[PDB]
Amino acid sequence: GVTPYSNESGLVNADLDVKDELMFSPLVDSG
Amino acid sequence: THRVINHPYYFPFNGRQAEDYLRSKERGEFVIRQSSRGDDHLVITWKLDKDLFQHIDIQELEKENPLALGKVLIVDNQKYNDLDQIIVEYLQNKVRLLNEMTSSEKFKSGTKKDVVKFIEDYSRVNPNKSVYYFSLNHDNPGWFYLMFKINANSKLYTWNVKLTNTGYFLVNYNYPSVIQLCNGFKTLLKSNSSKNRMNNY
């Protein structure tokens, strides 16, 4: 049939290709 | 073939009719319907957002006759006893987790292009900060984009988070909450980053 089943897709993640220093916000308590 | 399924949410819809029926409904509403994959399958179609729908396969086992609903139902590789259990334990948890994500301060509404624009603008203003947001994947319902820049001059990376009924799946793990997903994303990237800097010689 025509209907898509998006729970069956697989989406590839781009590889991190840099040595740059990460500067994200802090981790936080999970609560 | 037209199966008589005795359930308050059963409609004999194709996927397009199901989406049309749900168009004016709210997030989390759904229909159960006949499958194009055969008389041992059903579909649950549910609404994530405006014009955004997901169709999930239900595999039937232990069928007493070819047209009757199987006494065992498989959804996303897990076994359920009946359609009400699927609604309660599969669908309603998935909707709960969708609302948790779209309620997060790390979630941005809009198309991918809209969110890239915000990320680029945010990076222009904060060029030495790493920036990341989640947004809805409109082309693959049930997924989120996880978009990030390391700094103003870095490329914009897109990773993919799958919504499940028990959490948010990213790379190798199903994070049970958005806070843990954010913490885990940072940990994962710190790990890959420190690996990139290793001296293999």
Numbering used by the authors:
A (entry chain B): 1469 to 1499
B (entry chain A): 1250 to 1450
What is the paper's account of this structure, in its own sentences?
Phosphorylation of CTD residues is thought to recruit multiple co-factors, including the essential and conserved transcription factor Spt6, which directly binds to and co-localizes with RNAPII at sites of transcription. The C-terminal region (residues 1250–1440) comprises a tandem SH2 (tSH2) domain that is tethered to the core by a flexible 21-residue helix and contains both of the two known SH2 structural motifs in yeast. The N-terminal module (nSH2) resembles a canonical SH2 domain while the C-terminal module (cSH2) is vestigial and does not conserve the residues that are normally associated with binding to pY-containing peptides that comprise the vast majority of known SH2 domain ligands. We therefore took an unbiased approach to map the tSH2 domain binding site within RNAPII and, contrary to the earlier assumptions, found that Spt6 tSH2 directly binds the flexible, 86 residue Rpb1 linker (residues 1456–1541) that tethers the heptad CTD repeats to the RNAPII core.
The unit cell and space group were the same as the earlier pS1493 complex crystal, and molecular replacement followed by refinement against 1.8 Å data to Rwork/Rfree values of 16.2%/19.8% revealed a very similar structure, with additional electron density corresponding to the N-terminal region of the Rpb1 peptide that includes pT1471. The unmodified Rpb1 Y1473 side chain occupies the typical position of the phenolic ring of pY, while the phosphate is instead contributed by pT. The phosphate is displaced 3–3.5 Å from the canonical location, and is hydrogen-bonded to the Y1473 hydroxyl via an ordered water molecule. This allows many of the interactions that stabilize binding in conventional SH2 domain interactions to be conserved in the Spt6-pT complex. For example, the water molecule that bridges the T1471 phosphate and the Y1473 hydroxyl is anchored to Spt6 through hydrogen bonds with the hydroxyl group and main chain nitrogen of S1285, which is analogous to the SH2 BC2 residue that in many SH2 domains is a serine or threonine that hydrogen bonds with the tyrosine phosphate. The 3–3.5 Å displacement of the phosphate relative to conventional pY complexes allows formation of an additional hydrogen bond interaction with the main chain carbonyl of Spt6 G1264 (SH2 αA2). In many SH2 domains, the αA2 residue is an arginine or lysine that forms a cation-pi interaction with the pY, so a glycine in this position may open the pocket to allow the displacement of the phosphate seen in our structure.
